[PDB]
């Protein structure tokens, strides 16, 4: 009964394909099961993406208000919605994007970062940058949850997502304030509560940002601290491609993927 053996049964029983990875630290080793595999961003390029705006900008561009319309919402976008009329501010954005996985929130953030058109090479660059030569982003909201299995485009796996985050919440690779308000938002995320949030005790702390996409897509990656403030990166990828594009996802396989992964992390 090793680990990779539960994490078949889960896909068995769910009729799934799981992608789990956990990096490896100074006294655990890495758990990794289909970890090198392909699987669709969804809204899990929305954290590296908000980091791409922080990175690049004074903390004062968050104040910049960007200005839309109805015709700008052609996705899923609980926010841009009640701010249509009004606009959003780059901050607000980013916060929408992370805490609300909004669609339109997103989009505008990649026009922001690459300009029009340029917006999915700029997030993959900043990838680049990051030394992940396997991801990318190749459609805005809402195509890219909506490649067939198999395409490549707006892919990651498991393993390099895991690693891109690592650098941005507990590494380098942003300076402590911006590092802060990244954490902060995924932190007080609203779409991550049955995912890795329900596998990890109420006193672990946990960020999050989800995916949800076309034949079943159910991401989540999230960092989690033990009570005593020890870090952990998890990234759970799935999909459920013999459903069909209309494949219902299932959060509770994440859910449980992640209560696998936290009984690992939390024994002694
Ligand atoms: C982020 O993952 C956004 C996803 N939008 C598409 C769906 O959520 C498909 C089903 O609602």
């Known amino acids: 009964m090793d680990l990779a053996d539960r994490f ?35 809204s ?15 903390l004062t561009h968050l104040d910049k208000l960007i200005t839309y319309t109805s015709d700008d919402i052609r996705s899923i976008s609980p926010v841009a919605q009640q701010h249509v009329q009004t606009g959003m501010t780059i901050g607000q954005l980013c916060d929408a994007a992370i805490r609300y996985s909004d669609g339109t929130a997103a989009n505008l953030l990649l026009a922001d970062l690459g300009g029009p058109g340029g917006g999915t090479a700029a997030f993959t660059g900043y990838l680049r940058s990051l030394g992940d030569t396997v991801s990318r982003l190749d459609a805005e909201e809402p195509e890219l949850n909506r490649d067939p299995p198999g395409d490549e485009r707006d892919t990651t796996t498991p393993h390099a997502i895991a690693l891109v985050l690592q650098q941005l919440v507990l590494g380098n690779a942003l300076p402590p304030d911006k590092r802060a308000l990244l954490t902060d938002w995924m932190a007080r995320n609203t779409t991550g509560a049955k995912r890795i949030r329900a596998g990890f005790p109420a006193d672990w702390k946990v960020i999050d940002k989800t995916g949800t996409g076309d034949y079943g897509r159910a ?3 999230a960092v989690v601290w033990s009570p005593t403030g020890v870090p952990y990166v998890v990234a759970v990828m799935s999909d459920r491609a013999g459903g069909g594009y209309d494949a219902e996802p299932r959060e509770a396989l994440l859910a449980e993927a992640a209560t696998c992964v936290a009984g690992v992390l939390a024994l002694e």
């Not at 009729?15 to 990875?21: K, N, W």
């Not at 899990?44 to 004074?58: D, G």
């Open 8 to 42: 078949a049964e889960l896909e068995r029983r769910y009729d799934a394909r799981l992608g789990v990875y956990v990096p490896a630290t100074g006294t655990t080793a890495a758990i990794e099961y289909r970890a090198d595999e392909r699987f669709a961003f969804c």
């Open 219 to 221: 991401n989540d990656i």
């Open 44 to 58: 899990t390029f929305k954290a590296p993406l908000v980091a791409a705006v922080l990175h690049q900008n004074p």
